[PDB]
Each structure stands twice: as C-alpha cells, then as structure tokens.
Amino acid sequence: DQICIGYHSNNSTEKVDTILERNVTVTHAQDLLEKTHNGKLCKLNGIPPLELGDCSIAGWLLGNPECDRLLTVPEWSYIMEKENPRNGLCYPGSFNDYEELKHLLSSVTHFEKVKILPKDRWTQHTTTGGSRACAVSGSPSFFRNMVWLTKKGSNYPVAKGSYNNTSGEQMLVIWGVHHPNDEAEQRTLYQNVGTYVSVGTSTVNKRSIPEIATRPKVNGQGGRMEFSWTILDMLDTINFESTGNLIAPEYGFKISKRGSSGIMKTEGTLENCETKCQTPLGAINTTLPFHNIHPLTIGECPKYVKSEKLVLATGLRNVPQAGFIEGGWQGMVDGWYGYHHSNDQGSGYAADKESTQKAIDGITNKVNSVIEKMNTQFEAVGKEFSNLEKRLENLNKKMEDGFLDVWTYNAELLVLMENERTLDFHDSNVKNLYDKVRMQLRDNAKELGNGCFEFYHKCDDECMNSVKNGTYDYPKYEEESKLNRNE
Amino acid sequence: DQICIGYHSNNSTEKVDTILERNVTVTHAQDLLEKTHNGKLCKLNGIPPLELGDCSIAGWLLGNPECDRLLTVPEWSYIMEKENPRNGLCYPGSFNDYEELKHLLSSVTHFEKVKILPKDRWTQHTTTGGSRACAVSGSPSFFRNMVWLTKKGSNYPVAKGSYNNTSGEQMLVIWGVHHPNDEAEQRTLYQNVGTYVSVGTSTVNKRSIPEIATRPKVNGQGGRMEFSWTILDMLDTINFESTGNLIAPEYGFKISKRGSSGIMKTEGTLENCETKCQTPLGAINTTLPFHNIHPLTIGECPKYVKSEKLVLATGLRNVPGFIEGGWQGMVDGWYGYHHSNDQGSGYAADKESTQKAIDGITNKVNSVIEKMNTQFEAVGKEFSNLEKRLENLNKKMEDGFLDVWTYNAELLVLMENERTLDFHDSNVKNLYDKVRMQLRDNAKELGNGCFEFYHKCDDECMNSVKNGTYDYPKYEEESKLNRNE
Amino acid sequence: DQICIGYHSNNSTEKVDTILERNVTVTHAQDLLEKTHNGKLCKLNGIPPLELGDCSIAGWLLGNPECDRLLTVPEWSYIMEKENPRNGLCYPGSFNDYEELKHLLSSVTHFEKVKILPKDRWTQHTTTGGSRACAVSGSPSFFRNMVWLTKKGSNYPVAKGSYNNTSGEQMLVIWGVHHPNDEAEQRTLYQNVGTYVSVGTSTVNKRSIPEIATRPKVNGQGGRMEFSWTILDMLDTINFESTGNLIAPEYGFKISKRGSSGIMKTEGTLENCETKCQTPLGAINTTLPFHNIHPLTIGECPKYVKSEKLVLATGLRNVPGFIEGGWQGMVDGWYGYHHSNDQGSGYAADKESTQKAIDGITNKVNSVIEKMNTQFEAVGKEFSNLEKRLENLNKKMEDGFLDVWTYNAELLVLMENERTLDFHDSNVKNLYDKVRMQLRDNAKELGNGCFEFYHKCDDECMNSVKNGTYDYPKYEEESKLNRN
Ligand SMILES: CC(=O)N[C@H]1[C@H]([C@H](O)[C@H](O)CO)O[C@@](OC[C@H]2O[C@@H](O)[C@H](O)[C@@H](O)[C@H]2O)(C(=O)O)C[C@@H]1O
Ligand SMILES: CC(=O)N[C@H]1[C@H]([C@H](O)[C@H](O)CO)O[C@@](OC[C@H]2O[C@@H](O)[C@H](O)[C@@H](O)[C@H]2O)(C(=O)O)C[C@@H]1O
Ligand SMILES: *[C@@H]1O[C@H](CO)[C@@H](O[C@@H]2O[C@H](CO)[C@@H](O)[C@H](O)[C@H]2NC(C)=O)[C@H](O)[C@H]1NC(C)=O
Ligand SMILES: *[C@@H]1O[C@H](CO)[C@@H](O[C@@H]2O[C@H](CO)[C@@H](O)[C@H](O)[C@H]2NC(C)=O)[C@H](O)[C@H]1NC(C)=O
Ligand SMILES: *[C@@H]1O[C@H](CO)[C@@H](O[C@@H]2O[C@H](CO)[C@@H](O)[C@H](O)[C@H]2NC(C)=O)[C@H](O)[C@H]1NC(C)=O
Ligand SMILES: CC(=O)N[C@H]1[C@H]([C@H](O)[C@H](O)CO)O[C@@](O)(C(=O)O)C[C@@H]1O
Ligand SMILES: *[C@@H]1O[C@H](CO)[C@@H](O)[C@H](O)[C@H]1NC(C)=O
Ligand SMILES: *[C@@H]1O[C@H](CO)[C@@H](O)[C@H](O)[C@H]1NC(C)=O
Ligand SMILES: *[C@@H]1O[C@H](CO)[C@@H](O)[C@H](O)[C@H]1NC(C)=O
Ligand SMILES: *[C@@H]1O[C@H](CO)[C@@H](O)[C@H](O)[C@H]1NC(C)=O
Ligand SMILES: *[C@@H]1O[C@H](CO)[C@@H](O)[C@H](O)[C@H]1NC(C)=O
Ligand SMILES: *[C@@H]1O[C@H](CO)[C@@H](O)[C@H](O)[C@H]1NC(C)=O
Ligand SMILES: *[C@@H]1O[C@H](CO)[C@@H](O)[C@H](O)[C@H]1NC(C)=O
C-alpha cells in the first residue's frame, strides 16, 4: 500500500540556455534556425534566370557586339550580373540616371524589342559609321541598336523623326549625343558648327549642345558619348530633331510582363535545379521559420536573423536518478507525470490524464504563438547609388543594419524568456499535483520522506483509482485508519 | 464555529488573452484601443481649414482663372487637396522644385499678398497677352498674378525691374520663362532671337536661355512655360533683367503667422463640426491612449497601433472554501473572510489587502500608459517621379517603425495580463497559509480550503485573529483537553 | 536546541525601482549610467585636433588671407569648427557640392600640399590680379592657393595646362570660374566675349560659360565666383583649357593618411588634457556601459540612452526568525542558519545557496550588459538649403532609433529587478520548507518562522540536520516518550 509522485525522464542529451543559467539540459527541444545550403544557383519555379555573363546592363541594352547572345531573351525570374563587368561601353562615355533605370528594371520580368525607326529611312545621311573601339574581326563596327548619322557628300540636312506609341504598353527609348575632341573632327564629321540636339515628348523637354575639349585617351579614343532615356506612355508621341551629333535609336523596348524580380550580384553560373527561393550564396530548402545565411533573398524564405543558435525547450529538465524529490523515472513512457502505485497485491506506473493534456495544449499553443508573432519582420531590398550620393548610401546601410539588430535582439530575448517560463511552469505543475494529492488525502497517512506517503489503513485497487480520480472519501472508512493510528 | 477563505466574484463576461492560453474571463477589465470615427471633416479649435476644392497648389499660387474664389484667403489650420486636381496649369508647362515648395508650405499658416511690381510700370511693352488655354467666356486670358510681356510696335527694349523687401518678413517670389515651338513664333512674339532671362539676388544667381523645338500638342498648345521660385530675405533686393520670353510677377506673398499645419489628401468636403484632432477618414473624440484608424493625424491625437484588440485585465478569474470557487455574496472587498460564529455569521473581507492590490494595479496601468508616450509619429511627404528610391526609403522607414511599436505594445499587454493573474493567485494563497500559520494547530483542517475552529470563542476571538493578535496561551489547555478525547 | 531561518541585513539606503512599485530600499545595488563630464576639449590618444578658429572649410582650402596659420597642418584627430564661421569666402560666391566634400573629408586624417602648376608657367597672361574684398593692410590681394588670369597687354591667348598624377595617391583639385557684373567689366578684364572654361579628365567632362547680370552689392562687389572640385586618381591626367574667366589652381591636395575622424560643431578652444572619448560638451572617463551626455561622440565610449536613472539591484530587500525581518548580525552569507544548542548559540549561515545566488547574479549582470552591445551609433551629416526633406528624414532616423533602444533598456532593467526580488524570496521560502520537510514531526513551530525541537539533540544533531543528513528513525524514541 504505497503511492508516489514523479515525472518521466529519458536519455536525451540536447541542451538549452535560459536567462539565469547556461547549457542546461532538457528532455525535448525543437530547433528554429536553418543554416545550411547547397551553394548553387538554380531555377526558380521552373523559370530560369537571365545570365548576363561578362556583359553589363548598359551593354545589353545598347547592344554591345560582344553580347551577341542577348539579342533575344525569353522570360526570366531574376538577373545575374558580375560585380565588375568587362564589356560595358565599348566607346567611352557615360549614362544619365543609370541607377534609376536599374531600380525600374528590378521589377520587370519580360521585354519585347520593337523596330520604331528603320535604318533605311534616313536617305539624306550616312548610316555606316563605326569605330575601332567596338570592332569585330579587326573591321570597325558599332552598337547593334543605335545608328550613327554622319554627313553624306558635303552637307548635313536637318534630321527629323517621330513615333506614335500604338504598341499597347509602355515603351522605353534611349538616345545619345556625341562629343568630339577638337574642331577639325567636328568639321570633318558633321560639316557644321554650333549644332544642337533636341528631344520632345508630351512631358519631356530637352535640348543639348555638344561640348568640345581635350581629354585623356580611353580605349584609344578622345571622344565621349552621353546617353539618356525616358519612358514613353500610352498613345503618346516622341519627336527627334537635330543638326548633328545625334545617335538615333533603332529599336524600342516594350514592357510586357511586369511582375516581381530583382538584381543579384554574384560570380557563379547557372545549374539545373528547382528551388523555392534563391540566395547569392546558394539555395535554401527548409521549413524552419528562421535562417542566417544572407540578408538579401529572392522568392519566399523564412526571416533572416543575425544569430547563431535558437533552440526552444519543450520538455522537462532531465535530472536522472522512488519520489519526485530525487529525480525522474526511466520506466514512465506513457505520460509526462508520475502517479506510481504499489499495492499489496501489485504495483503500477500509471499517470495523470488531466495534467498531460493541458500541458500539451499550452506548449503547442505557445509554440504557434511565438512562431506567429514574428511574422511581421523587416525585409531588405538591394539598391544602387552613384559616386556623388554617399550620404544616401550611408543612410540606406544604417537603416538595414539598425532594423536587423533590433529584430535579432527581440527574437533572442523572446526565446530565452520562453525557455525560463516553460521550466518554471513545469515545476510549478509538479508541486501543484503533489499538494493537490496531499489535501485530497485528508491525513490518514504519513510522509516517509521520499516525496510520498504510506497509507495507514488497508485500501484496495478501487481505493487507488478513487484517489486517482479525485474521488477519495475520507469519512468513508476513516474509522479503521483512526484505530490503526491509535496503536 | 469556523471560518473560511475565498474571493469575490460576479457575473461579468469579458474576455482577455495571455501568453499561455487565450480567451479567458475576468471580473473587471479595461480597454485601451479606440476604433470609431464620425467620418467627417471639420474645424480645428475654431479655425476652418483651407479647401482648395478642384485646384492644385500651383493653380492657386499662380492665379488660375478657375480658382477665382481663392484670391483672398483668411487664416487656416490645414489644407485639403484632391489626388489629381483638374485645374492646375492652364498653359502646359512645368514647375521647378515643386516638392520642396510643398514641404516649405506645410508649416505656414497665413499668407498676405503684396503688390511689388505694378503692371502699369512697363511703359515700353505690351501687357495684354493671353491664350485660349486659360480662357473665360470665350475670350483669351492669362493667370491673375503673372504678366506676359510682349513686343510693342516692332521693338523689344531691354526690360529692367527691381524690388527692395521692406515689408517686415520673408517673402516668396515666382517668375517664369516661355519656350516657343518654332522660329516664326519667337520672331512674331519678341522680334529677336538668342534672348535670355537673368535673375539675381544677394544669394541666388541664375540665367536661362529660351529653347525652341517641336512637341506634341497638349491642351491645344505647342509651347511650354517653366516656373521657378525663391525666398527673399529681410531688407534684401531682387533684380530682374531680360531681353524676351520673360513672365514677370506682379504679387509677392509675405509669410506671416508661421506655425504647425499639414497637407491633407482626401475627396471629402468641409462640414459644420468641431474636433480636436483630424484624420483623413474622420475626426476622433476619445480619451484612450491608442487608436487604429489612420497613421496620419493633425493636432494632438493618441498613438497609432496596427492591431485590432488591446484589453488590460485588472480583475480575477471568473468561476462559480477557496478551492471550489468564488463567492458572489461579497462586494465590499476582494478576498474572502467568510465567518460563522456560534451566535451568528458574516461575509467580511480583508480591507488591508485590497488597498495594496488596487494601488498596485493603478500604478501599473499608469506606468504602462507612461512608457509608450515616446512613440514614433509619421509626417506626410511628397516625391517627384524621378526619386523612386527616396520614396521607397521613406515608406520602408514608416512601416518598420510602426511594426516595431505594434509588437512592443502587444507583448507588453500580454506580459502584464499574465503577471496580474499570477499575482492575484499569489496573494490569495499567501493570505490562506498566513492565516493557517497564525492559527497554528488549534483547529482541524476540513480539506476544503477551510479549517473548522476547534477552540470555542465569541466574536472577540476571531476579531483578534483577523487583527493578527490571536494568543496561543489563552486557549491551549482546553483545546488540548478536548483533543485528548 | 533551537534553530531558525533568516537572512542577512545591513544599513544600506539605496532605493531601486520596479514595474510594481517605486523607491524600494535594498541591500546592495549597482549603477549603470554615467552623467558627468569635465567640460573640456583636448587631445585624443595624444594627437591634438585641428582647430579652425574663425575660418570655414572653404576658407582653409582656398587659402583666405585671414587664415594664414593654416598654410601647413600636421596630423589631426577631429576638426573643430564654429556653426557660422566669419572668414569664409572673402570674395562673394558659392561652392558646388559643399556637403559631399565635407562628408568625404570626414574620414581623412592628414593632407599633403603638392605644387602641380607653378605660377610663373603662364608667361602669356597676367597673374598679379587682386581685389579689395580680400585685402591685407589696405593693398588688394587674393587667395593664396589660386591664380587669377587676366589680359597681358591687349591680348588673351588661349590658356592650356595639364598635369599627370604621379605623386602616389589620390589627389583633390579645385578650380573656379568668374562671373562679371556688366559687359564693360568683362571687356576690360578679358578683352573677349562668349568665352568658356573646359575641364577634362578620364571620368569627368565639363564646360562652363560665364554669365553676366546685375546683382546686389555684397562686400562691396557685384561679381561672383563659382568653384568646383574633383578627385584625381592614380596615374590619371587632368586638362585645363579656357579663353577667359578662369581661376586656375596652384596647389593640389594629396590624401596621405586615411583613418576615422569627424567634424564637431563647438564653440570652445583646445585645452591641455587627455581622454579616450570626446563629446561636444566635454570628455568622458568612466567604465560604466551607458551615458546620457550627448548623442554625437568621437572615439570609443559607452552607448547613449535618453534616460535619467538606471539602477540594478543585486541583493535582498532591506528591512529590519525570517518572518520578523532581517538579521543585523548576519555578515557571512545571505541566508541565515541560526544555531542555538544547550551549551551555546551560533550564527552560522548557509554556504550552499549563497554560491548559486552569487553566480546567478553575476550571470544575469553579464547577460544584461552584453545583450545591448550591438546598439545603434549616430554619425554627423550636413545638408544643403534645398534638401530639407533629407534633413528631416535623417532626424527622424536618429530620434526613432534612440527612443527604441532606451525603451528596451528600461524594460529590461525593470524585469530584471522583479525577477531578482522574486527569486530571493523563493530561495528563502524553499530553504525553510525543505528544513521543515527533513525535520519530520520532532518539533513544534513556535510561530517565529522556526520550530522548537522536541527531543533533546546536540551539536552533532545540529550539524547533521544542517548538512541535510538527518535520520528520523535513528533517534525518535525519546521524542515519542516525551510526546506524552
Ligand atoms: C564616322 C566615324 O566613325 N569616323 C571615324 C571615327 C571618328 O573620327 C572619331 O574617332 C570618333 O571619336 O574614328 C575612327 O577612326 C579613328 C582614328 O581617327 C584618326 O583621325 C586618329 O588619328 C586615330 O588615332 C583614330 O582615332 C575610330 O576607329 O574611332 C573611325 C572613323 O575613322
Ligand atoms: C501674345 C499671345 O499670347 N499671342 C498668341 C499666342 C502665341 O502666339 C502662341 O500661340 C503661344 O505659344 O497663342 C494664341 O494664338 C495662336 C493660335 O494661332 C492659331 O492660328 C493656331 O492654329 C493655334 O494653334 C494657336 O497657335 C493661342 O491660341 O495659343 C493666343 C495669342 O493670340
Ligand atoms: C497616335 O495614334 C492614335 C491612334 O490612332 C491617335 O489617336 C486618334 O486620334 C484621332 C484624331 O485624328 C481620333 O479620331 C482617334 O479616335 C484617336 N484614336 C483613339 C484610339 O483614340 C493619335 O492622335 C496619334 N497621335 C498623334 C500625335 O496624332
Ligand atoms: C533697401 O531698403 C533698406 C531700408 O530702407 C536700405 O537699408 C538702409 O540703407 C542705408 C544706406 O546706408 C542705411 O543708411 C540705412 O540704415 C539702412 N536701413 C536700415 C533700417 O538699416 C537698403 O539699402 C535698401 N537696399 C538697397 C539696395 O538700397
Ligand atoms: C603619366 O605618367 C605615367 C608614369 O610614367 C605614364 O605611365 C607610363 O606610360 C608609358 C606609355 O608610354 C608606359 O610605357 C609606362 O610603363 C607607364 N608607366 C607605368 C608605371 O606603368 C602615363 O602614360 C602618363 N600619362 C599619360 C596620359 O601619358
Ligand atoms: C584684376 C582685378 O582684380 N581688377 C580689379 C577688380 C575688378 O575690376 C572687379 O572689381 C572684380 O569684380 O576690382 C577692384 O577694382 C575692386 O573693386 O576690388 C580691384 C581690381 O582693380
Ligand atoms: C537512448 O534511448 C533510445 C531508446 O530507444 C535508444 O534508441 C538510443 O540509442 C539511446 N541513446 C544512447 C546514446 O544510448
Ligand atoms: C556551457 O555553456 C557554454 C556557453 O556559455 C558552452 O560554451 C559550454 O560548452 C557549455 N558546457 C558544456 C560542457 O557543454
Ligand atoms: C527539400 O527537402 C525535402 C526534405 O527535407 C525533400 O523532400 C525535397 O525533395 C527537397 N527539395 C528539393 C528541391 O530538393
Ligand atoms: C476564444 O478564442 C479561441 C482562440 O482559439 C477561439 O477558439 C474561441 O472560439 C474564442 N471564443 C469565442 C466565444 O469567440
Ligand atoms: C466627445 O464625447 C463626449 C462624450 O460625452 C462629449 O461630452 C463631448 O462633447 C464630445 N466632444 C465634442 C467636441 O463634442
Ligand atoms: C520615491 O519615489 C516615489 C514615487 O512614487 C516618490 O513619491 C517619492 O517622493 C520618492 N522618494 C523621495 C525621497 O523623493
Ligand atoms: C580616469 O579615472 C580614473 C579613476 O581613478 C583615473 O585613475 C584615471 O587617471 C582617469 N583618466 C584620466 C585620463 O584622467
């Protein structure tokens, strides 16, 4: 006739950390952080990305001779570009608002080349110009998308061109103006002086004047070229007029499948896989709600935290050794709480039903809640800046770092707090069960000193299950117990 | 014959949430989130706002003929403007640094129109130009503040004008340049080519050259007009000089009564009402410290939280001895002192514990309100179509800060709810075992959170017991004699 | 033959705060905030700063005659500059991208002046020009680092100049263009009209045109000057070419020592002392991990929080058995174990719970001071008069982040205080109930929180029950006999 209280223990070895103690041991724990990747660039949802190779965005758009494989591109999901591309602008020059164009391009998925000004339409000029900088097989050449207008014979008639956008979507147009290096070159190229280039649309008004100066040679050239761009609207019209130094476009780019994408800076190549999201260092395939690989990602993946370990305790403090004051019992595999019984006719290792289910519900509800709360984390997006906007770059970097630090601190503190609370709740529950049993057993027994007491009158297995069900009736057979303790 | 401990209960049915479980019932609860608005736009401390109606800011400033009701404007409190006003620039063109002007205007309450350059002072030019773009009653017209200088006869003498700012406050001046669409138009208008417009002050020095090209027709016009602005200082002067294509001003705006204001983006209309803080969706009249209507407000108004429920539990768990449930028969205090003597009974309560309980919860609520008084407040801003990066940066800033503060508020509320519940349980248990310890062994524990007094006594006995002055040597001998049986 | 449980008490009168009540007296408390300073500016790590005085950055770089002390400058640590310097541009004008230049200069520790275009090389023009705006001792003068080119006789031949950067590091070059105020002045100064100034490098291409207009008189002059700057790279070349209105440079600045520094907008003068961190109000020499002096600091120094009190408790709640209050005579540990046998008494304390309490306190202190080590730092910046939106956005940045971090710190310390007090109470109660549990029933609880013993034990009994080695079946027959 003996019953005692304890808890289930096993041979686990995982460890967790709390606000007051470190590397403490627990019965069951669940990880929350993913830190492995396959280290490859692979397809996203079956749509292979666009591999720029050695070229650059400007080289691809203008049609550099080297980038001959990019004359027609299918749909893509993200753009892969190197850090310092080689084949950029073959003829030296610049590009106004490069970074704005890149930011706009970041959210475009497909393109469509449209011929807006056929080359042969210029019947009063020369259109076969080319330089040695952009040369193939020794012979000079030029970009594949623009036309160089030079005087034919000995005169340069005024050049006029216009287009009405009836394609069906917004169009992107690029044009350029050439700056010579000395007056003799200007005279022998355009047979005029003091020329101008004027571009007009419904909302854009521009008029540029070529500049002549002496500059250091780049790629064996003393000249320069300056390019500009604009977004042509629906049913609008753009007008071209110049007296020289004009680089007219020959193709227009029409946005067709505007979606969500990004630009990724890496040096890798393209493999054959299929992931759910991509990272510059590789691809991630996991279900945990956290990762610490790289702050910039494309697709869908868990949040990024700048930590290294995040372990959530969901069990008892494993303290292996017939009572709860010495430790748990290895023989308990059914429930989480000890209700060991030992009658005269036999013993048993029963558990308590009420406590186990409430504990299970509490822990699963709390796990769901802690997962759910952090769903509003901050996310980062790549951006570009020129060399005259250092303040903006500093501001952007500070934003990213500050928000990442704040969220990291929040998550770590929450996890440590939760571990501590879980341990305290479990131990509180164990004393709660014990003293509930003690008051239920109105005297009639003495504590041996092993966290449990021995009954002073002989009950039976019916009495055991009656006490277990919280249905013990003290005045029912109290007289025999009184007689026994009278001894 | 015995006394028992319990706690007061009632029939309230409000629900709160905590970290461990959700949707639990407490006797008394408080609310912190306000989520109702009257859906109207009205005054602000008796100062009606400025209702631009169907005009944009540029149209009002330049003096578009449509916005003829805004020629003179009294003091205002905030400015209401539609998303895409119809009457903006009648003559097609552009405005330089529009967004900076709007941001500067966001913190000015009153204006004052001052005539600086009288129209009749130009005695060597023609000042009756106009166009069909800004036409009233069929006849061509122009803006009501600028002057279009054209050639008189067949010559265009150089134009000179100046003004010295002695008004007594900073001034705002606007001028403009005109770009024709062909050489013949320029020759017909100004008789000369290769002209220029020069503007010079003590700090700003500028010079523009008119540009000629062919453009698509907008509003039936091929030309364009470019406008620029500057701020004059006290006791400063500004000099105008040009040979053509000059759009001279006639009125300067003097800044008086600088204060705090804003720009409001809505399609509503002013009504007859009074409020204390205003939102794009309506007014707010409440004393709670939180709301979730709209992030942009004007005037003093509670903090904004992107959530939907915020309830602070200040009571006990509701259930129907203290181990079986509470008692509805107790309303004076909080904790149970069910007394039942031989000659009577009672439902007294511990007045002492109630005092520390109520002051604790009150200062807790006050502190919780206090900690979040330093919230982050958003401010409206405007960006052109060439600063998408800046606009994205600003939007990300706002969303990040709002999310951070929302998370903080929710976590704090849950923490406090759990702490309060555990605290109340702790005081109940502490009172129980303290009473048991004071009573020592001169009784028998009935096992129902109540022990039956074993020593016989009148009201003085347990009166001293609740007073904490129970004397063991008073009734140890008789109790021992009785329990010896 | 009696024992009782208690806790050590002292006479300390330091009050702490918590989320439940205010101004609670404790036994031992720490501090984490520093709020004092010497109110002086002096050397950082033994390297004196650069003291501009009354000259702005432009005045120093161009070589204003007033700032003659700054012709040669040694290494520095940070730059001291008044908010509205007087001796700026002696000749009225402007500067292109002034703020970008200041931001770039914020991270440079030493310069090096190199003569790239000697003055006498211009043999076809006149280089003795000067104005009354920058006048020393009555006679007209000019900037010390620029050359003004005028007509030579009655002709202005085309001016050309070039320089190849072989110095060995990145160089900074400054040039300028002159805007007259009337046509007669332009003719009498340069003999030509419709001139231009052209500057060309491997990356920068520019061509400006002088502008003529009427302007108000500033400093007695109606003209204006416009300056620009660029960064010359390794083995690059810069070409100058103009036909008038050119302000050619004479010295090039070479970036020698690159490091970390900043610009401080102060008003005082350099003093003679040493420090490790510097703030616009004074120097800080402490070891606590927080301060509330000024958001902008230079060097290494604790973090900035916008609070007024951060007190951490690390001891029992001070209050004069354990139910009556503390023990003034307990000076050994933290949990009393009062021993009193028939032959004598004792004041032994528990040496077990003390060590775990101490190590837990140390662990929590380290954790709290370590969690915030990844805080946010503020860096000074400057914005022009047409970038109000940028300045507003920067201010909102700084204020928001500071508020977030100070709120987090206060919340953490309050929770820590609550947990510590509750933990100590739990420890003492647990010790008492554990002692009672081992005692079994051979004593009667007097009511002072401790029980008078039943059967006459001795010092061996006393130390055995102290060690948790009591054996109830060993010696209880005497208790049973005397129970009657
Ligand atoms: C229409 C055209 O392409 N013309 C020239 C072109 C231009 O004259 C100029 O180079 C543009 O910047 O240059 C090309 O020949 C260049 C050649 O010109 C000599 O005069 C000079 O001495 C050489 O050093 C070299 O620059 C070219 O390949 O760039 C093509 C064509 O002759
Ligand atoms: C001084 C003035 O305002 N004159 C004209 C003005 C200008 O001549 C010019 O059009 C503004 O850019 O324009 C207006 O008249 C011109 C009108 O002439 C028709 O023949 C033509 O078909 C129209 O497109 C238009 O150019 C005008 O209506 O804009 C008014 C004024 O007489
Ligand atoms: C560009 O093409 C569109 C499409 O034809 C032109 O819009 C038409 O204009 C005529 C006016 O002569 C109207 O009768 C049609 O109804 C318009 N079409 C539509 C679909 O609205 C537009 O005018 C052209 N652009 C220019 C500058 O002429
Ligand atoms: C603009 O008006 C102001 C005020 O009339 C002029 O300032 C005065 O200038 C004279 C010239 O010596 C001084 O004697 C006065 O003391 C000035 N007034 C004050 C109040 O100080 C100013 O000169 C005028 N601007 C111009 C360009 O003449
Ligand atoms: C500036 O000076 C450098 C240093 O001499 C020049 O670089 C040399 O150029 C010649 C070409 O004739 C090469 O043979 C040398 O090997 C280069 N030197 C080094 C160290 O690489 C440079 O060319 C000069 N700048 C210009 C525009 O000529
Ligand atoms: C080469 C030169 O410096 N010339 C003269 C200049 C110019 O003529 C203009 O004034 C400059 O804008 O002006 C002064 O007369 C003057 O008033 O200080 C000084 C000098 O005699
Ligand atoms: C722990 O016990 C389980 C029980 O099945 C067993 O499989 C496992 O090997 C044990 N681990 C060790 C390290 O013995
Ligand atoms: C104890 O915890 C620390 C973390 O502070 C850890 O580095 C160490 O490995 C742990 N001890 C053991 C035996 O794992
Ligand atoms: C991702 O991992 C799961 C197992 O964790 C596997 O079943 C699945 O095939 C993986 N996905 C890919 C694309 O390899
Ligand atoms: C209370 O909240 C719980 C949360 O799971 C929900 O299941 C339950 O339906 C809610 N009760 C009511 C009455 O809405
Ligand atoms: C706001 O509501 C209270 C509630 O009674 C009312 O007394 C008060 O008049 C209201 N405010 C205004 C401006 O009407
Ligand atoms: C301690 O703090 C409380 C805050 O409620 C304040 O009322 C009291 O005056 C403070 N003590 C002293 C000595 O100022
Ligand atoms: C900083 O304070 C400590 C405190 O004693 C002192 O020893 C040290 O000399 C101080 N440092 C300086 C530079 O004065």
UniProtKB/TrEMBL annotation, chain A:
Q: How is it modified after translation?
A: In natural infection, inactive HA is matured into HA1 and HA2 outside the cell by one or more trypsin-like, arginine-specific endoprotease secreted by the bronchial epithelial cells. One identified protease that may be involved in this process is secreted in lungs by club cells.
> Which molecular function GO terms apply here?
host cell surface receptor binding
Localization annotation: Host apical cell membrane; Virion membrane
Its GO biological process annotations read:
clathrin-dependent endocytosis of virus by host cell; fusion of virus membrane with host endosome membrane; fusion of virus membrane with host plasma membrane; viral budding from plasma membrane; virion attachment to host cell
Give the CC-aspect GO terms: host cell plasma membrane; membrane; viral envelope; virion membrane
Q: Which domain of life is it from?
A: Viruses
UniProt feature coiled coil, ranges? 371-398
Report the record's disulfide bonds.
55-67, 277-301, 459-463
Q: How does it sit in the bilayer?
A: Single-pass type I membrane protein
Short name of one Pfam family for this protein?
A: Hemagglutinin
Q: Which UniProt keywords apply?
A: Clathrin- and caveolin-independent endocytosis of virus by host, Clathrin-mediated endocytosis of virus by host, Coiled coil, Disulfide bond, Fusion of virus membrane with host endosomal membrane, Fusion of virus membrane with host membrane, Glycoprotein, Hemagglutinin, Host cell membrane, Host membrane, Host-virus interaction, Lipoprotein, Membrane, Palmitate, Signal, Transmembrane, Transmembrane helix, Viral attachment to host cell, Viral envelope protein, Viral penetration into host cytoplasm, Virion, Virus endocytosis by host, Virus entry into host cell
Quote the subunit structure annotation.
Answer: Homotrimer of disulfide-linked HA1-HA2.
Biological role stated in the UniProt entry:
Binds to sialic acid-containing receptors on the cell surface, bringing about the attachment of the virus particle to the cell. This attachment induces virion internalization either through clathrin-dependent endocytosis or through clathrin- and caveolin-independent pathway. Plays a major role in the determination of host range restriction and virulence. Class I viral fusion protein. Responsible for penetration of the virus into the cell cytoplasm by mediating the fusion of the membrane of the endocytosed virus particle with the endosomal membrane.
Membership in a protein family: Belongs to the influenza viruses hemagglutinin family.
Protein name as annotated: Hemagglutinin
Recorded source organism is Influenza A virus
From TrEMBL, chain C:
Q: How does it assemble?
A: Homotrimer of disulfide-linked HA1-HA2.
Coiled-coil residue spans: 369-396
Post-translational modification note? In natural infection, inactive HA is matured into HA1 and HA2 outside the cell by one or more trypsin-like, arginine-specific endoprotease secreted by the bronchial epithelial cells. One identified protease that may be involved in this process is secreted in lungs by club cells.
Q: Which family does it belong to?
A: Belongs to the influenza viruses hemagglutinin family.
Q: Name one GO cellular component term.
A: host cell plasma membrane
* Descriptive protein name: Hemagglutinin
Q: Which Pfam families match?
A: Hemagglutinin
Q: Does the keyword Membrane apply?
A: yes
- What keywords are annotated for this sequence in UniProt? Clathrin- and caveolin-independent endocytosis of virus by host, Clathrin-mediated endocytosis of virus by host, Coiled coil, Disulfide bond, Fusion of virus membrane with host endosomal membrane, Fusion of virus membrane with host membrane, Glycoprotein, Hemagglutinin, Host cell membrane, Host membrane, Host-virus interaction, Lipoprotein, Membrane, Palmitate, Signal, Transmembrane, Transmembrane helix, Viral attachment to host cell, Viral envelope protein, Viral penetration into host cytoplasm, Virion, Virus endocytosis by host, Virus entry into host cell
Annotated InterPro entries: Capsid_hemagglutn, Hemagglutn_HA1_a/b_dom_sf, Hemagglutn_influenz_A, Hemagglutn_influenz_A/B
Listed GO biological process terms: clathrin-dependent endocytosis of virus by host cell; fusion of virus membrane with host endosome membrane; fusion of virus membrane with host plasma membrane; viral budding from plasma membrane; virion attachment to host cell
Gene transcribed to yield this protein? HA
